[PDB]
Amino acid sequence: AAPVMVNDCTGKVGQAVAEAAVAAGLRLVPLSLTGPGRGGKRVVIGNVEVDVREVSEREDVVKEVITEYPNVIVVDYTLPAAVNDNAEFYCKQGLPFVMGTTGGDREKLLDVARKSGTYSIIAPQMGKQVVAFVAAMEIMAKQFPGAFSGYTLQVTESHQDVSGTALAVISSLRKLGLDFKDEQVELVRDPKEQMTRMGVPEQHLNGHAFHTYKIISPDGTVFFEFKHNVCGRSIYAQGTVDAVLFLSKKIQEKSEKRLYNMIDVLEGGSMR
Amino acid sequence: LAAAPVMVNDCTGKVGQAVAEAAVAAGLRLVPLSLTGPGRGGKRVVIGNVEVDVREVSEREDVVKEVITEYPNVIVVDYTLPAAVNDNAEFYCKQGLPFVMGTTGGDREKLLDVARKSGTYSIIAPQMGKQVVAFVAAMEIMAKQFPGAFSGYTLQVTESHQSTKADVSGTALAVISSLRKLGLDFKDEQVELVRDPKEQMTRMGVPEQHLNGHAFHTYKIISPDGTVFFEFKHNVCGRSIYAQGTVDAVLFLSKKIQEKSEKRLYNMIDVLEGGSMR
Numbered sequence: 255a256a257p258v259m260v261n262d263c264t265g266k267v268g269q270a271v272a273e274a275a276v277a278a279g280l281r282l283v284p285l286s287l288t289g290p291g292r293g294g295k296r297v298v299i300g301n302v303e304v305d306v307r308e309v310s311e312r313e314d315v316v317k318e319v320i321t322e323y324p325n326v327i328v329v330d331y332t333l334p335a336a337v338n339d340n341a342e343f344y345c346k347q348g349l350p351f352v353m354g355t356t357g358g359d360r361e362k363l364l365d366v367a368r369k370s371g372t373y374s375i376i377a378p379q380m381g382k383q384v385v386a387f388v389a390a391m392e393i394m395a396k397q398f399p400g401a402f403s404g405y406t407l408q409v410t411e412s413h414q415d416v417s418g419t420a421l422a423v424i425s426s427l428r429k430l431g432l433d434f435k436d437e438q439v440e441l442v443r444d445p446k447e448q449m450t451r452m453g454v455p456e457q458h459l460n461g462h463a464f465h466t467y468k469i470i471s472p473d474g475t476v477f478f479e480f481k482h483n484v485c486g487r488s489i490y491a492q493g494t495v496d497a498v499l500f501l502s503k504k505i506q507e508k509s510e511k512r513l514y515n516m517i518d519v520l521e522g523g524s525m526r
Numbered sequence: 527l528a529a530a531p532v533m534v535n536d537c538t539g540k541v542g543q544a545v546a547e548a549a550v551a552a553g554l555r556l557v558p559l560s561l562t563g564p565g566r567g568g569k570r571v572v573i574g575n576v577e578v579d580v581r582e583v584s585e586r587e588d589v590v591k592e593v594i595t596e597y598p599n600v601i602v603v604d605y606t607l608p609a610a611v612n613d614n615a616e617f618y619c620k621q622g623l624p625f626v627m628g629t630t631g632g633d634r635e636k637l638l639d640v641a642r643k644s645g646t647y648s649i650i651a652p653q654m655g656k657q658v659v660a661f662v663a664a665m666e667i668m669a670k671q672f673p674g675a676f677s678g679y680t681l682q683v684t685e686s687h688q689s690t691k692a693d694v695s696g697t698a699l700a701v702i703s704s705l706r707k708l709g710l711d712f713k714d715e716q717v718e719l720v721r722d723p724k725e726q727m728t729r730m731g732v733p734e735q736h737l738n739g740h741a742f743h744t745y746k747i748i749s750p751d752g753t754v755f756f757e758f759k760h761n762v763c764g765r766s767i768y769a770q771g772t773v774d775a776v777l778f779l780s781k782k783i784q785e786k787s788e789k790r791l792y793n794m795i796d797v798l799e800g801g802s803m804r
C-alpha cells in the first residue's frame with residue numbers, strides 16, 4: 255500500500271486520519287500543508303514527526319514529497335474555500351488524492367479530476383458503514399414498492415437543519431409506501447435530551463450523529479427499529495484509510511477508471 | 527377482487543386459524559372444508575361468518591374431490607406441521623392443486639423440486655411476514671453489494687420466541703449469513719435465545735398477552751473502538767403479519783394463474799416485487 259500525505263495533519267479530521275493511518279501501518283509522509291495564517295511547525299502523529307509547512311510553500315513541499323515518495327497519495331481534509339484550488343493543484347501536479355473536505359463547487363471539483371484523468375476518491379461522506387446502510391436501504395426500497403404501506407414512520411435524530419443521511423433514508427422509505435414529510439423528523443438539540451433520550455456519551459455532544467428509524471404496523475403488533483450512532487471522527491478516519499488502500503490498488507492495476515466515490519470503495523471489499 | 531377461493535389446512539391450527547380469519551375479513555371466499563392432523567377428530571369451527579367442516583387427514587382424497595368440484599379455482603393454504611410438508615406438497619402437485627405453503631421444516635430441496643418439476647402454481651416460503659422478508663433482503667443486498675463492509679466489527683444477536691420454539695429462528699440464521707459476508711465473525715450457536723418469560727418481558731419488552739406467540743430479534747453491530755453502533759430490531763407480536771402476508775401471497779398467485787404465467791414456483795420476494803395489492 256502507498257505512502258500518504260495528509261493535508262492538514264493539524265486540522266481535527268486530518269489529525270485523526272494521520273493517526274489512524276500510522277496505527278494501521280501506512281507510511282505517513284513526514285510533511286504536511288496547513289492553512290492561511292497558520293505558521294510552520296513540527297507535530298507528532300504516533301511515532302512520526304511531521305514538518306508542517308505553510309500553504310504558500312506547496313510547490314516546493316510537493317517536490318520534496320514526490321522525490322522521496324513517488325507513489326504518494328494525498329489525503330485532503332482542509333476547508334470549503336480550499337477545495338477547488340487544491341483539486342486543480344493536485345490534478346496539475348499529477349498527484350492522486352482522496353478528498354474528504356466538504357463544500358466548494360462540487361461539479362467543478364469532479365470535472366477537473368475526471369477531465370485530467372487523475373486517480374482520485376471524492377466523497378463528502380467517508381463514514382463508510384453508514385454509506386453502506388443508506389445505499390442498501392435504497393436498493394431494497396426500489397426492489398419492493400409499497401412493502402410497508404399503512405405502517406407508521408417515526409424518525410428521531412441527533413447531530414449539531416436535518417441530516418442529509420436521514421433525508422436520504424426517508425426518501426427510500428417513501429418508496430416502501432410510508433407517508434412522512436421532512437418536517438416530521440424530530441431533531442434533538444437540547445444536550446440533556448441528547449444524553450438522556452438518545453444515549454450520547456457526555457464526551458461526544460459536540461461531535462456525533464445518532465439516528466433512529468421506527469416503523470410500526472397500524473395494529474401495533476409489528477415493530478421495526480434501525481439505529482446508526484456515530485461518536486466522534488473514527489469512522490471517517492477508518493473510512494479514509496480504506497479509501498487510500500482501494501485507490502492504491504487501482505493505481506497499481508493501472509485502471510482505466512480514475513474518479514471513484516465511497517460506493518466504489520465499498521464494492522471493492524475489505525482490504526484489512 | 528376476482529381472487530381465488532382458499533382452502534386453509536389446518537384452520538384449527540394457530541396460524542391456519544389466523545390466516546383463515548384474515549382471508550375472510552379481507553373479502554376472500556373461504557372454502558367451508560378443512561383438513562386437520564393425525565390424532566385430531568373431525569369437527570366444525572366458525573371463522574368469521576363461515577362454518578368450516580373440519581375433516582381428519584385420512585379423509586383427504588374425498589375431501590379434496592368435494593372441494594375441487596365445488597371450488598375448481600381453489601388455492602390451498604398449508605400451515606400444518608414439518609412432518610407433513612413433503613407428503614402434503616407431493617399430494618397437491620399430483621392433484622394439480624395450486625398452493626401457498628408457510629409450514630416450516632421438511633426436506634426443503636425436495637419440496638421445491640417437486641413443485642418446479644410438476645409445474646404446479648405455488649408460493650413456498652418459511653417466512654410469510656413480508657415486511658420481515660424485506661428486512662432480510664436489505665441485509666443480503668448490503669452484503670452482496672458491499673462485502674466485508676463491517677470487517678472487524680463485533681456482532682451480538684439476541685432472539686425471543688415462545689418457550690415451545692426451542693431452536694434458533696430461520697430468519698435470524700439467514701440474516702447472520704449475510705452479516706458474515708459483511709465481514710462479521712459469528713457462529714450460529716452465539717445467538718442468545720431468550721426463552722424464560724420473565725426475561726422476555728423485562729429484557730425484550732414482550733407484552734404478557736403475547737408470550738405464547740411472538741418473534742423478537744435484535745442485531746447489534748459495533749466497531750472495535752465502540753464509537754460506531756448499528757442496531758436492527760424486528761419484533762412481531764402474534765400472527766397477523768403472517769396472516770396478512772399469506773393473503774397477499776394468495777392474491778398474487780391467483781393473478782399469476784389467471785394470467786397463465788410460464789413461471790409456476792414463486793416465493794415472498796416475488797410477492798414483494800409485485801407491489802401492494804391492497
Ligand SMILES: NC(=O)c1ccc[n+]([C@@H]2O[C@H](COP(=O)([O-])OP(=O)(O)OC[C@H]3O[C@@H](n4cnc5c(N)ncnc54)[C@H](O)[C@@H]3O)[C@@H](O)[C@H]2O)c1
Nearest residue numbers: 262265266267287288289332336354355356378379380490
Ligand atoms: N468526508 C467526511 O466524511 C467528513 C467528515 C468530517 C469532516 N469533514 C469535513 O472536512 C473538513 C475539515 O474538518 P475539520 O473539523 O478537520 O476542520 P478544521 O478547521 O479542524 O481543520 C481544517 C484545517 O485545514 C487547514 N487549511 C485551510 N486551508 C488550507 C489549504 N489551502 N491547504 C492546507 N490546509 C488548509 C486549516 O488551517 C485547518 O487546520 C470540513 O470541510 C468538514 O466539513 C468531512
Ligand SMILES: NC(=O)c1ccc[n+]([C@@H]2O[C@H](COP(=O)([O-])OP(=O)(O)OC[C@H]3O[C@@H](n4cnc5c(N)ncnc54)[C@H](O)[C@@H]3O)[C@@H](O)[C@H]2O)c1
Nearest residue numbers: 536539540541561562563606610628629630652653654768
Ligand atoms: N411461514 C410463516 O410465516 C410461518 C409463521 C409462523 C409459523 N409458521 C409455521 O407454521 C406451522 C404451524 O404453526 P402453528 O403454530 O399454527 O402450529 P399448530 O400446531 O398450532 O397448528 C398446526 C396444525 O396442523 C395440523 N396438521 C398436522 N399434520 C397435518 C396434515 N397432514 N394435514 C392437515 N393438518 C395437519 C395439526 O393437527 C395442527 O392443528 C409450523 O411449522 C410453524 O413453524 C410459519
Ligand SMILES: [Ca+2]
Nearest residue numbers: 264265292295
Ligand atoms: Ca496547529
